[PDB]
Structures are given as C-alpha cells and as structure tokens.
Amino acid sequence: KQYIISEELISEGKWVKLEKTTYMDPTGKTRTWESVKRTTRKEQTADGVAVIPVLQRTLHYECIVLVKQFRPPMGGYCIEFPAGLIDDGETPEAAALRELEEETGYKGDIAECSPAVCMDPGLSNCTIHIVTVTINGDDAENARPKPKPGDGEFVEVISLPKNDLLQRLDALVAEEHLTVDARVYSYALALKHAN
Amino acid sequence: KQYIISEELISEGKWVKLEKTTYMDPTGKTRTWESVKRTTRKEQTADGVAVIPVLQRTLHYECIVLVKQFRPPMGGYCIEFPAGLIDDGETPEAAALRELEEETGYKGDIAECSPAVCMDPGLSNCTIHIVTVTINGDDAENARPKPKPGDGEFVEVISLPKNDLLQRLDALVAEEHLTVDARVYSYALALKHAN
Ligand SMILES: Nc1nc2c([nH]c(=O)n2[C@H]2C[C@H](O)[C@@H](COP(=O)(O)O)O2)c(=O)[nH]1
Numbered sequence: 001k002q003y004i005i006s007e008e009l010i011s012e013g014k015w016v017k018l019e020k021t022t023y024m025d026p027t028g029k030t031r032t033w034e035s036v037k038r039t040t041r042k043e044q045t046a047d048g049v050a051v052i053p054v055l056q057r058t059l060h061y062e063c064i065v066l067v068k069q070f071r072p073p074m075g076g077y078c079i080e081f082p083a084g085l086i087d088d089g090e091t092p093e094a095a096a097l098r099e100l101e102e103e104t105g106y107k108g109d110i111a112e113c114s115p116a117v118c119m120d121p122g123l124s125n126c127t128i129h130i131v132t133v134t135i136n137g138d139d140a141e142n143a144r145p146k147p148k149p150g151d152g153e154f155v156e157v158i159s160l161p162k163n164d165l166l167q168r169l170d171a172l173v174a175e176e177h178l179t180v181d182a183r184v185y186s187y188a189l190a191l192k193h194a195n
Numbered sequence: 196k197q198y199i200i201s202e203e204l205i206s207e208g209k210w211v212k213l214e215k216t217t218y219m220d221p222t223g224k225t226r227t228w229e230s231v232k233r234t235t236r237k238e239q240t241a242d243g244v245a246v247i248p249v250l251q252r253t254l255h256y257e258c259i260v261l262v263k264q265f266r267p268p269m270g271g272y273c274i275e276f277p278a279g280l281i282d283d284g285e286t287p288e289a290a291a292l293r294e295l296e297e298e299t300g301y302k303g304d305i306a307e308c309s310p311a312v313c314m315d316p317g318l319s320n321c322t323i324h325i326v327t328v329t330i331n332g333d334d335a336e337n338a339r340p341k342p343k344p345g346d347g348e349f350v351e352v353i354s355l356p357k358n359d360l361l362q363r364l365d366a367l368v369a370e371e372h373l374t375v376d377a378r379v380y381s382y383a384l385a386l387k388h389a390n
Contacts, residue, residue, distance in 0.1 A: 118377060154220060
C-alpha cells in the first residue's frame with residue numbers, strides 16, 4: 001500500500017548522490033525521507049558482492065578469510081569480508097571468485113549465493129549478493145596465494161578459525177582499535193547461537 | 196599507516212550529510228573519498244542498534260523475531276532486525292530493549308551486546324551495536340504481543356524458526372520480491388553452515 005511518490009535530487013558527487021524521497025504511507029499521508037544512492041548504478045542484479053571465503057585444510061579447523069583496510073568514511077581500519085562491484089554481463093558468482101582472488105589471491109569454488117540483500121535500508125538503496133566460497137587449502141593452487149590489489153587498494157589478509165570466530169574477532173578489536181563489519185559480526189554471532 | 200587529512204563538507208540535509216574526505220595512503224600520497232554521514236549522531240555513542248530477538252517457548256524451536264517495513268531508499272519492503280537510533284545518554288542495551296517492545300510488543304532480556312560495528316564502511320561511518328535479546332514467549336506478559344509504533348512507523352512482525360531461517364528468508368524474497376537485510380542474511384547463513 002506504500003509506494004515511492006517522487007525523488008528529488010539534493011546533491012550529487014561523482015560516486016554518490018543525496019536526494020529526498022517522497023512516499024505514500026498506508027493511512028494515505030505523504031511523507032519524505034532522505035536517501036543515498038550510488039550514481040554508478042546500472043540495471044543489474046545488485047551493486048556488488050560480499051564473499052565469505054571458507055578456507056578448508058584437511059585435518060584442520062576451517063578458517064574464514066577476511067580483509068583489513070583503511071576506510072576513509074570510518075576514518076580508520078575495518079575488518080570485512082572480501083568485497084567488490086559486479087561488472088557488466090558478469091554473474092554474482094563470477095564476481096565473487098574474481099574479487100576474492102584480487103584481494104587475497106585465493107582461488108575458490110562456489111558454495112552458494114544469496115539473493116540481493118540491502119546494505120543499510122534506512123539510508124541507501126545499496127544491495128549486494130553474499131557469496132559463500134570454499135577454498136581448498138590443500139590444493140597446490142592455493143599454496144601461496146598472491147593477491148593482485150587494485151592500484152590504490154591497500155588490503156591486508158586475515159584468516160581466522162571459523163570454530164572460534166567471534167572470540168578471535170574480539171582479540172583483534174582489543175589488540176588495537178579496529179571496527180568489525182556488521183555482516184562479519186552477524187555471521188560470527190550465529191556461529192555461537194546455532195550450537 | 197593511513198590517516199585522515201581533512202573532512203571537508205560537500206552538501207547537507209536534515210538527517211544526512213555528504214562529505215569529501217582527504218587522506219594519506221601508505222605511500223604518503225593525498226587521496227580523496229566521498230563519504231556519507233548521519234547528522235543525527237550523538238557523540239560518545241554509535242548511530243543506533245540492531246536487535247537479535249530470540250523467541251523462546253517450551254513447545255517450539257527457537258525463533259528469531261524480524262520486522263517488515265517499507266524503506267523509502269529501497270523503494271520497497273525490507274525484512275530486518277528490529278532497529279533504531281540510540282537516544283542521548285541512553286545505553287545500547289536499553290535502546291535495544293525499548294526498540295524491540297515498540298516495534299513488536301515483546302518484553303525481552305539482554306543476552307549480550309557487541310562493540311560498535313560498521314554498517315557499510317565503503318560508503319558511510321554508520322555504526323550500530325548488535326544486541327542479542329531473549330524473549331520468554333511462555334510468559335503471559337508476552338501472550339498477545341501488542342506493539343506501539345511512533346510517528347508514521349508501520350511495522351509488521353515476522354518470527355521465523357532459528358533452525359531453518361535461511362530457507363524461510365529466501366522464500367519471502369521470491370514470493371513478495373521484498374528485500375532481506377544483509378546482516379539478517381549473514382546471520383542466517385552462519386546458522387545454516389553451523390548446523
Ligand atoms: N562513495 C565512494 N565510493 C568510492 C569512491 N572511490 C571509489 O573507488 N569508490 C567505490 C568504488 C570502489 O571499487 C569501492 C571500494 O569498495 P570495496 O573495496 O569494498 O570494493 O568504492 C569515493 O570517493 N566515494
């Protein structure tokens with residue numbers, strides 16, 4: 001019963017545009033709402049992808065591969081799943097494998113892929129696909145993974161034991177100031193609640 | 196290794212502002228970045244909270260209480276953890292318990308509270324505390340959960356089985372074509388992987 005009535009541009013930068021959205025609520029009243037959108041958005045399946053890289057070594061605890069990097073908006077360093085934008089004609093799965101190899105050097109196999117999910121529904125219209133990728137750590141291919149970071153992309157790789165993710169995450173945040181990503185934390189939480 | 200140089204504003208609204216962030220890469224080079232920030236942010240505290248409500252009845256498997264509501268930026272309906280901003284001087288736990296009762300009618304108890312985690316570090320400085328809250332669904336006090344939403348808040352309540360959260364989520368995303376929050380889904384994936 002609720003729908004977008006109109007969208008008024010407020011401002012716009014190269015990458016992001018700020019705008020005011022008017023919409024109709026159930027009762028029948030008209031309301032506004034300040035939203036954020038990525039200008040670089042085409043008619044695709046989603047904006048980007050987040051990769052959950054599960055490093056699997058025989059006779060070893062599974063590991064989750066995470067990346068650490070400076071985030072200007074945060075004014076500091078954050079711990080996140082490897083992530084990046086999807087290219088034209090590119091499949092979410094294909095983008096996941098590509099992005100994972102760029103940031104960490106690992107070459108994995110698709111495990112599963114989510115439908116498009118919203119990053120922060122109360123702010124932007126940004127969506128991503130969450131792709132679960134397994135990485136054969138015994139495979140010679142993944143022996144000594146070599147990351148090919150983008151020119152201007154400074155990323156550190158961090159593999160944590162899946163069996164103890166949350167606790168290992170706290171150990172870093174306590175070792176130094178550092179912001180864990182909400183999605184990463186949500187994942188680590190569910191690992192404890194499940195069992 | 197990397198540090199902020201300046202945060203020069205670009206534009207602003209009543210709730211959200213757009214900024215130009217100047218920083219230094221590890222090589223000493225001055226780079227720039229377009230960052231979004233909520234103007235409604237109180238110091239000494241994160242932007243808001245996300246609540247993970249575990250509904251507990253003796254006759255049923257544990258459920259996770261989610262909320263569906265129209266999100267203007269997404270131009271559609273979203274399924275998220277009950278969430279909201281943290282009032283001044285208020286504690287994340289108190290904000291989480293309040294926000295839960297308002298949107299769902301449930302009276303819960305704190306299980307745990309995460310540190311400040313980022314919502315979308317590549318885009319914004321938005322952070323939240325993920326507060327896990329248990330709900331005794333057998334207590335007569337939670338017999339007929341009667342919500343009390345504020346100004347223009349139209350929220351529908353959806354409790355889904357913990358041991359099959361992801362299956363239910365995917366179903367909803369297809370049928371009603373609405374969107375599931377990235378943090379809700381990440382949590383759902385870990386539950387599935389962990390079982
Ligand atoms: N909002 C914003 N996004 C940017 C800027 N520069 C820039 O490369 N981006 C986008 C495209 C990059 O691939 C992406 C970096 O995020 P990831 O590393 O998660 O892909 O952000 C900028 O100045 N502002």
